Amino acid sequence: PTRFARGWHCLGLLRDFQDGKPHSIEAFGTKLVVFADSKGQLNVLDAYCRHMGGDLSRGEVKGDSIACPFHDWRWNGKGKCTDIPYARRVPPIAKTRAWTTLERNGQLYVWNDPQGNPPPEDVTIPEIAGYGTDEWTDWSWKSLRIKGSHCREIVDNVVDMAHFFYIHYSFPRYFKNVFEGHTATQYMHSTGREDVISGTNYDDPNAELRSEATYFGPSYMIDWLESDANGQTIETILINCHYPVSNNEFVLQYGAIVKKLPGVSDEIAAGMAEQFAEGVQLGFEQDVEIWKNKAPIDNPLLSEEDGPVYQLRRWYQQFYVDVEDITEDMTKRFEFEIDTTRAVASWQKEVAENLAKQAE
Amino acid sequence: PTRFARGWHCLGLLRDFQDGKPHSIEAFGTKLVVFADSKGQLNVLDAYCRHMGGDLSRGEVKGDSIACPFHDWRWNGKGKCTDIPYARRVPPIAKTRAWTTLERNGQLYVWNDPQGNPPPEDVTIPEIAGYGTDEWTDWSWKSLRIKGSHCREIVDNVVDMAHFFYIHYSFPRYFKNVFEGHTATQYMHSTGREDVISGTNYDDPNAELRSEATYFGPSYMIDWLESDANGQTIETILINCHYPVSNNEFVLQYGAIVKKLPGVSDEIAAGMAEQFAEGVQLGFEQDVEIWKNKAPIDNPLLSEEDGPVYQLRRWYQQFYVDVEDITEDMTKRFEFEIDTTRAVASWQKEVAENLAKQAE
Amino acid sequence: PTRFARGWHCLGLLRDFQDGKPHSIEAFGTKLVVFADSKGQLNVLDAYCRHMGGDLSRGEVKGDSIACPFHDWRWNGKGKCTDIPYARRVPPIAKTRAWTTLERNGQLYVWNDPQGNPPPEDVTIPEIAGYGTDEWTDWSWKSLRIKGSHCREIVDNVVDMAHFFYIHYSFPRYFKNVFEGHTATQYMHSTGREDVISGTNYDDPNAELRSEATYFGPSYMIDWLESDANGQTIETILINCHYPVSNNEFVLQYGAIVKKLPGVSDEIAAGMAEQFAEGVQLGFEQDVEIWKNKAPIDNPLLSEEDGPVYQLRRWYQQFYVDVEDITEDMTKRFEFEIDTTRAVASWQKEVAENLAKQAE
Ligand code: FES
Ligand code: FES
Ligand code: FES
Ligand SMILES: [Fe+2]
Ligand SMILES: [Fe+2]
Ligand SMILES: [Fe+2]
């Protein structure tokens, strides 16, 4: 009916699944069950039992298999029926759909592919250096649902230079995109507007914000943020990721970790990190207010100061065709820098005009 | 997909739009923004910005243009992009859909037409003599949504003689329809039932109610009501109008103004007018109870005492075909009078039977 | 669009319809009105009036006809317009859809058939011996709606031997199905599990439960239950029935009557019957928890201990084809006994293992 993106998708944080009860996720137009085996590893299958349609997510784990609450059949992490407890044997074709998993960076990922193939080794989610380490906090994480929109409308932001001023209240002084293979990257530097105070990580006019944000596949973005304040620089890592529930609904997730400042107690270091982590969340929530309130546009009208929207969408298209049909122009290295001079000039004028009105 | 009526449609009262923030209206299967320019005149455009789909209704007005809250592009009342503030020029094709407006009788109207043409001069909404005048009150106005029905099911009432007895508790003693060009008219006179007391303008058995109600196009009806009580006659004007939200939902609006009785103080004159205005609203709300609870019928079964339903629907059909395809039988003057003698005889009998039971 | 089962369907208890106002039932993809005539007999018609679509369920009864609340036309139990009170005659084709009724066992049934034929005499609902009698209680009855599922998913339970252990906490020691003509029967005997206490009629490990449950057509099941406790045996009768609201929603109803134990006062006999009646309801509510939480399966994966699912569905299919197309294999007597030995052996082991853990 409706085609979902081939790639890694994060279903949430490991710590929310290791408990070791089963969990339901509505995703990819169906329902999924997540459960830990006896060795604590996570498994993902279609939630609905292939016997008579019982809900495996409402079952319990027994050994290394999930047990259906209707007639107690047992399904393992590869989708195989390991036992029908009241029958001599298992019909030889007792198999359901199993999703390949990846546990990394304190998160759970599943591989989706309509063609039914496994993830190739060169398509993965990178290890975030610093995670699982006293130096860095643990994820502050949040989640919501957006309806009436596509996943792609989030991805469109990769190339959106102008919204940094209007939505994040900052001047994007450097802005560059690089699309290559199965990744899409935004590099940008900003300083905060003097005519606005809102407690985000974009706020400070005295600090330069340096951002490198990359989609590792269609659904998962890691944004490395450095805020140079005084001599010292605050390092954070923001995750922006999504997965489709249906053709018309998706889950959007975002989380932050902050690097602890050294030569200070834990009480104070962990308290200030949390303080900055909230600022990052608030920045992200500025995008959310737009994303919850906007129509899709297949044929956007573009200005000379727009980022490379059509090339971004071309790159993204690779994840919605069969791998044999992916073309060179989708995956070949493409880069584009916007000279932000004109925009910043317009913006600095406007901000000066505001500041003049603020006093007199 | 689904075709909406060509014609003037009232979106509400001017005073609710002159404030001068933007307003959203869900109508004609899309979302609209209404906003005042610097000279206070109202403008209507599609709400969704043609750049990347931001919601203009959630923006602000700047001069004579609405400003998108996503990247601040500026759109004027003719749908032209007047400025991209951070870019040198406006792409030469920067245009969105603009709706032609009419401000009159303290209300805002928009012209809808699938063929995309402007309103011809001979198709308009007449000036209501008496509006904007100390002699007459201002609109008491109300609004609601009806789902699971068509606009046409409201229009069907033009020819419904019998419902005056069952729904408005009155005897329709005179009843006539005239359809002509783009108007459809109901003339009727009534007196109230003695066996029922409910505080509507149809209630009084001693007063004769005279009504002339005309659809000026497919969506907007003005009903001139005169209630002859004693020597003196109370004059009111009721509006019944609608506009479609989707193929399956519409907004129904109704409002009243009353002429102030002279030779009395303002406190008392304005207080009694309001008193009568409520009676009119209550009468209208009797129709609403039916309209919220009734199925559409494409092939109604008709009695010898029904009004000219098929001719009414034929007239109405003109608004759902292209102007080149409108036929003579749709627009040619048609009139039909129901002789209400038989019905009134049946009704007066039944009412007498009730009154006999009331006492003994 | 979507085809509903030909057969008797119970709309509820007679006592809820004899009052003698009209009642609406949403069923078979439309709305229905139920009303008592002057002799107290019940009538069922489409709710929407064939004049202009008024809601007959919101009308009142006048003599032997329901009166539309919009223009007061009168419709009798055979769907004929008996009067247009304000008109000389009734158009000669004034007919709406009438549903054939059956009042029996304190319940109201309607005959549905897409082919528009009347119920044949040999297809009926049997008189429940004991109903309407001091010896037996009156129906304790309950009702709910299930969405996202088909009627058939309830019917699938006829052949579900295994769920008695997992869902009703009992050992099915005897289990047999017989399908024949337009009936489908489940015979089973059980004893309760010692490792579980929940206050249902399946609970007692010391009592043998004997059940004979038969679908008399596609929608209505009567289950004769005998619980042999001590010397004395408790007799109950459970009804499980349904009717479709739409293709995607249905109403599920269940009720119980209990036979009063003799040689005891009424206060105590009626109090204990009610006590047992609740136990029966709780048992049924165990199925409801599964039925509210399960996906349809067109191609169920079956074990060697499954009941004859495909033959059951073949039998059921007769009610969704035209009577001329019903085949011998649908209606020919078919019987199947499951030898429950292996399952009970597995189950008794598992239960012993639990009991061992319970103590130590
Ligand atoms: S439905 Fe899952 S075991 Fe029967
Ligand atoms: S979406 Fe309207 S200005 Fe960019
Ligand atoms: S709609 Fe039923 S009588 Fe007119
Ligand atoms: Fe952003
Ligand atoms: Fe009316
Ligand atoms: Fe059951």
Side-chain angles (χ1 to χ4, degrees):
Chain A
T2 167
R3 182 163 184 169
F4 301 115
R6 173 186 63 263
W8 290 105
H9 290 75
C10 166
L11 303 177
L13 301 173
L14 294 182
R15 79 201 187 208
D16 298 346
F17 299 124
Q18 297 156 326
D19 75 347
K21 314 169 199 287
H23 296 82
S24 55
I25 297 297
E26 277 157 0
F28 304 108
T30 189
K31 191 171 175 183
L32 303 180
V33 57
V34 189
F35 71 93
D37 63 22
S38 67
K39 301 152 289 183
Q41 292 137 220
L42 294 169
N43 303 267
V44 179
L45 310 167
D46 287 5
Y48 291 113
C49 183
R50 294 286 158 98
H51 173 231
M52 294 291 286
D55 190 354
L56 301 180
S57 72
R58 301 169 54 84
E60 61 183 281
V61 180
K62 293 176 174 169
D64 293 335
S65 284
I66 184 72
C68 180
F70 195 5
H71 311 102
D72 199 45
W73 293 25
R74 311 301 175 76
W75 305 87
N76 73 23
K78 295 171 183 170
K80 206 186 187 172
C81 184
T82 53
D83 186 34
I84 304 178
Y86 54 89
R88 180 94 179 84
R89 62 184 57 75
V90 173
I93 58 270
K95 185 62 66 84
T96 185
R97 183 165 49 180
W99 300 70
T100 304
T101 52
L102 171 56
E103 317 190 22
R104 187 173 293 173
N105 311 318
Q107 293 158 64
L108 169 64
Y109 309 84
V110 287
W111 177 255
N112 185 61
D113 180 12
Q115 300 180 264
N117 298 327
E121 215 210 329
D122 68 334
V123 173
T124 187
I125 303 284
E127 302 253 35
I128 299 175
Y131 186 76
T133 262
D134 297 301
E135 282 71 12
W136 292 81
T137 64
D138 206 11
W139 298 110
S140 89
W141 190 272
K142 283 185 75 168
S143 181
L144 78 150
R145 274 145 178 272
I146 293 163
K147 303 187 61 161
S149 194
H150 311 307
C151 293
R152 192 189 60 184
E153 307 294 303
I154 304 304
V155 178
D156 282 333
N157 263 237
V158 165
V159 304
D160 187 352
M161 178 277 299
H163 90 291
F164 284 96
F165 176 76
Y166 298 109
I167 302 307
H168 300 284
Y169 298 112
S170 82
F171 302 99
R173 296 182 186 286
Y174 176 68
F175 192 93
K176 190 184 198 200
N177 288 125
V178 180
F179 313 143
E180 192 176 18
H182 60 89
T183 69
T185 300
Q186 176 199 90
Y187 300 100
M188 88 97 216
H189 303 163
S190 61
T191 63
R193 293 167 61 169
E194 264 129 23
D195 70 328
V196 170
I197 308 295
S198 39
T200 77
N201 63 321
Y202 299 96
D203 190 24
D204 197 352
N206 309 136
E208 193 208 51
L209 178 72
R210 290 176 289 115
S211 180
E212 167 178 355
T214 292
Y215 268 98
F216 293 91
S219 80
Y220 191 82
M221 166 189 268
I222 307 166
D223 187 4
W224 287 272
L225 291 160
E226 296 78 33
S227 177
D228 304 315
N230 315 332
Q232 71 157 15
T233 77
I234 303 158
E235 293 185 9
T236 57
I237 293 174
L238 171 61
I239 297 302
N240 167 12
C241 71
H242 33 93
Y243 66 80
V245 177
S246 74
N247 45 250
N248 185 51
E249 174 171 1
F250 63 88
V251 167
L252 178 62
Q253 301 184 96
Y254 56 106
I257 56 173
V258 181
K259 195 177 191 177
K260 283 145 164 173
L261 298 172
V264 174
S265 66
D266 307 352
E267 291 170 338
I268 283 80
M272 293 181 306
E274 172 59 38
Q275 204 59 29
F276 200 86
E278 290 175 37
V280 173
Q281 285 195 309
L282 287 165
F284 192 82
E285 285 162 9
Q286 298 170 312
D287 287 319
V288 168
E289 283 303 293
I290 289 303
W291 290 328
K292 286 195 301 181
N293 284 285
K294 74 165 292 280
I297 307 287
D298 303 322
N299 310 120
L301 201 70
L302 302 170
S303 79
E304 293 163 333
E305 312 300 316
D306 272 81
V309 172
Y310 287 116
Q311 302 88 332
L312 172 67
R313 295 185 167 180
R314 194 54 180 160
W315 164 88
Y316 185 67
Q317 190 59 19
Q318 81 185 259
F319 303 121
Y320 293 86
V321 304
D322 289 335
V323 291
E324 299 80 12
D325 299 332
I326 297 165
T327 49
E328 188 187 29
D329 66 353
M330 295 174 177
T331 58
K332 179 185 166 178
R333 198 191 149 89
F334 173 94
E335 74 191 63
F336 192 92
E337 170 160 3
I338 304 178
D339 177 1
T340 58
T341 300
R342 175 172 295 281
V344 175
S346 299
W347 291 328
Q348 283 181 170
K349 185 188 190 202
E350 182 191 334
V351 169
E353 285 175 356
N354 300 347
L355 282 171
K357 282 168 180 169
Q358 284 190 0
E360 168 80 15
Chain B
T2 167
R3 182 163 184 169
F4 301 115
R6 173 186 63 263
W8 290 105
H9 290 75
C10 166
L11 303 177
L13 301 173
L14 294 182
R15 79 201 187 208
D16 298 346
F17 299 124
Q18 297 157 326
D19 75 347
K21 314 169 199 287
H23 296 82
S24 55
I25 297 297
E26 277 157 0
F28 304 108
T30 189
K31 191 171 175 183
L32 303 180
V33 57
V34 189
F35 71 93
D37 63 22
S38 67
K39 301 152 289 183
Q41 292 137 220
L42 294 169
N43 303 267
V44 179
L45 310 168
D46 287 5
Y48 291 113
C49 183
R50 294 286 158 98
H51 173 231
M52 294 291 286
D55 190 354
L56 301 180
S57 72
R58 301 169 54 84
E60 61 183 281
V61 180
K62 293 176 174 169
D64 293 335
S65 284
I66 184 72
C68 180
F70 195 5
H71 311 102
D72 199 45
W73 293 25
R74 311 301 175 76
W75 305 87
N76 73 23
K78 295 171 183 170
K80 206 186 187 172
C81 184
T82 53
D83 186 34
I84 304 178
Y86 54 89
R88 180 94 179 84
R89 62 184 57 75
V90 173
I93 58 270
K95 185 62 66 84
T96 185
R97 183 165 49 180
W99 300 70
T100 304
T101 52
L102 171 56
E103 317 190 22
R104 187 173 293 173
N105 311 318
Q107 293 158 64
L108 169 64
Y109 309 84
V110 287
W111 177 255
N112 185 61
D113 180 12
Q115 300 180 264
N117 298 327
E121 215 210 329
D122 68 334
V123 173
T124 187
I125 303 284
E127 302 253 35
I128 299 175
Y131 186 76
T133 262
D134 297 301
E135 282 71 12
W136 292 81
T137 64
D138 206 11
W139 298 110
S140 89
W141 190 272
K142 283 185 75 168
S143 181
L144 78 150
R145 274 145 178 272
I146 293 163
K147 303 187 61 161
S149 194
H150 311 307
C151 293
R152 192 189 60 184
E153 307 294 303
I154 304 304
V155 178
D156 282 333
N157 263 237
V158 165
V159 304
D160 187 352
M161 178 277 299
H163 90 291
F164 284 96
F165 176 76
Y166 298 109
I167 302 307
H168 300 284
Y169 298 112
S170 82
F171 302 99
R173 296 182 186 286
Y174 176 68
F175 192 93
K176 190 184 198 200
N177 288 125
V178 180
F179 313 143
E180 192 176 18
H182 60 89
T183 69
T185 300
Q186 176 199 90
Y187 300 100
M188 88 97 216
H189 303 163
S190 61
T191 63
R193 293 167 61 169
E194 264 129 23
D195 70 328
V196 170
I197 308 295
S198 39
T200 77
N201 63 321
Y202 299 96
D203 190 24
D204 197 352
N206 309 136
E208 193 208 51
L209 178 72
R210 290 176 289 115
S211 180
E212 167 178 355
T214 292
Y215 268 98
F216 293 91
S219 80
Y220 191 82
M221 166 189 268
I222 307 166
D223 187 4
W224 287 272
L225 291 160
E226 296 78 33
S227 177
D228 304 315
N230 315 332
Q232 71 157 15
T233 77
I234 303 158
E235 293 185 9
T236 57
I237 293 174
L238 171 61
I239 297 302
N240 167 12
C241 71
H242 33 93
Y243 66 80
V245 177
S246 74
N247 45 250
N248 185 51
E249 174 171 1
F250 63 88
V251 167
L252 178 62
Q253 301 184 96
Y254 56 106
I257 56 173
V258 181
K259 195 177 191 177
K260 283 145 164 173
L261 298 172
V264 174
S265 66
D266 307 352
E267 291 170 338
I268 283 80
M272 293 181 306
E274 172 59 38
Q275 204 59 29
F276 200 86
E278 290 175 37
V280 173
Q281 285 195 309
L282 287 165
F284 192 82
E285 285 162 9
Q286 298 170 312
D287 287 319
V288 168
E289 283 303 293
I290 289 303
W291 290 328
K292 286 195 301 181
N293 284 285
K294 74 165 292 280
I297 307 287
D298 303 322
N299 310 120
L301 201 70
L302 302 170
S303 79
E304 293 163 333
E305 312 300 316
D306 272 81
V309 172
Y310 287 116
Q311 302 88 332
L312 172 67
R313 295 185 167 180
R314 194 54 180 160
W315 164 88
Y316 185 67
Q317 190 59 19
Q318 81 185 259
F319 303 121
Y320 293 86
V321 304
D322 289 335
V323 291
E324 299 80 12
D325 299 332
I326 297 165
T327 49
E328 188 187 29
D329 66 353
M330 295 174 177
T331 58
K332 179 185 166 178
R333 198 191 149 89
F334 173 94
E335 74 191 63
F336 192 92
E337 170 160 3
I338 304 178
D339 177 1
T340 58
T341 300
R342 175 172 295 281
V344 175
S346 299
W347 291 328
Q348 283 181 170
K349 185 188 190 202
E350 182 191 334
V351 169
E353 285 175 356
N354 300 347
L355 282 171
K357 282 168 180 169
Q358 284 190 0
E360 168 80 15
Chain C
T2 167
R3 182 163 184 169
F4 301 115
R6 173 186 63 263
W8 290 105
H9 290 75
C10 166
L11 303 177
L13 301 173
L14 294 182
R15 79 201 187 208
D16 298 346
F17 299 124
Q18 297 156 326
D19 75 347
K21 314 169 199 287
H23 296 82
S24 55
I25 297 297
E26 277 157 0
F28 304 108
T30 189
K31 191 170 175 183
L32 303 180
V33 57
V34 189
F35 71 93
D37 63 22
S38 67
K39 301 152 289 183
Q41 292 137 220
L42 294 169
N43 303 267
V44 179
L45 310 167
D46 287 5
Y48 291 113
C49 183
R50 294 286 158 98
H51 173 231
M52 294 291 286
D55 190 354
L56 301 180
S57 72
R58 301 169 54 84
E60 61 183 281
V61 180
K62 293 176 174 169
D64 293 335
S65 284
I66 184 72
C68 180
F70 195 5
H71 311 102
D72 199 45
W73 293 25
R74 311 301 175 76
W75 305 87
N76 73 23
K78 295 171 183 170
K80 206 186 187 172
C81 184
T82 53
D83 186 34
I84 304 178
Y86 54 89
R88 180 94 179 84
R89 62 184 57 75
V90 173
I93 58 270
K95 185 62 66 84
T96 185
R97 183 165 49 180
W99 300 70
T100 304
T101 52
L102 171 56
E103 317 190 22
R104 187 173 293 173
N105 311 318
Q107 293 158 64
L108 169 64
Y109 309 84
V110 287
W111 177 255
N112 185 61
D113 180 12
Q115 300 180 264
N117 298 327
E121 215 210 329
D122 68 334
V123 173
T124 187
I125 303 284
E127 302 253 35
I128 299 175
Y131 186 76
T133 262
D134 297 301
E135 282 71 12
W136 292 81
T137 64
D138 206 11
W139 298 110
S140 89
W141 190 272
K142 283 185 75 168
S143 181
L144 78 150
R145 274 145 178 272
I146 293 163
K147 303 187 61 161
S149 194
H150 311 307
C151 293
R152 192 189 60 184
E153 307 294 303
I154 304 304
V155 178
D156 282 333
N157 263 237
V158 165
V159 304
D160 187 352
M161 178 277 299
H163 90 291
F164 284 96
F165 176 76
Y166 298 109
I167 302 307
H168 300 284
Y169 298 112
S170 82
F171 302 99
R173 296 182 186 286
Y174 176 68
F175 192 93
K176 190 184 198 200
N177 288 125
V178 180
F179 313 143
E180 192 176 18
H182 60 89
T183 69
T185 300
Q186 176 199 90
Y187 300 100
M188 88 97 216
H189 303 163
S190 61
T191 63
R193 293 167 61 169
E194 264 129 23
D195 70 328
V196 170
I197 308 295
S198 39
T200 77
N201 63 321
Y202 299 96
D203 190 24
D204 197 352
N206 309 136
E208 193 208 51
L209 178 72
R210 290 176 289 115
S211 180
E212 167 178 355
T214 292
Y215 268 98
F216 293 91
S219 80
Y220 191 82
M221 166 189 268
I222 307 166
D223 187 4
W224 287 272
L225 291 160
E226 296 78 33
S227 177
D228 304 315
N230 315 332
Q232 71 157 15
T233 77
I234 303 158
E235 293 185 9
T236 57
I237 293 174
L238 171 61
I239 297 302
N240 167 12
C241 71
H242 33 93
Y243 66 80
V245 177
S246 74
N247 45 250
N248 185 51
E249 174 171 1
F250 63 88
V251 167
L252 178 62
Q253 301 184 96
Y254 56 106
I257 56 173
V258 181
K259 195 177 191 177
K260 283 145 164 173
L261 298 172
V264 174
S265 66
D266 307 352
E267 291 170 338
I268 283 80
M272 293 181 306
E274 172 59 38
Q275 204 59 29
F276 200 86
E278 290 175 37
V280 173
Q281 285 195 309
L282 287 165
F284 192 82
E285 285 162 9
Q286 298 170 312
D287 287 319
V288 168
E289 283 303 293
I290 289 303
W291 290 328
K292 286 195 301 181
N293 284 285
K294 74 165 292 280
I297 307 287
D298 303 322
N299 310 120
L301 201 70
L302 302 170
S303 79
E304 293 163 333
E305 312 300 316
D306 272 81
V309 172
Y310 287 116
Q311 302 88 332
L312 172 67
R313 295 185 167 180
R314 194 54 180 160
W315 164 88
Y316 185 67
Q317 190 59 19
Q318 81 185 259
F319 303 121
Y320 293 86
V321 304
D322 289 335
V323 291
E324 299 80 12
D325 299 332
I326 297 165
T327 49
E328 188 187 29
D329 66 353
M330 295 174 177
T331 58
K332 179 185 166 178
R333 198 191 149 89
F334 173 94
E335 74 191 63
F336 192 92
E337 170 160 3
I338 304 178
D339 177 1
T340 58
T341 300
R342 175 172 295 281
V344 175
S346 299
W347 291 328
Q348 283 181 170
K349 185 188 190 202
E350 182 191 334
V351 169
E353 285 175 356
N354 300 347
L355 282 171
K357 282 168 180 169
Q358 284 190 0
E360 168 80 15

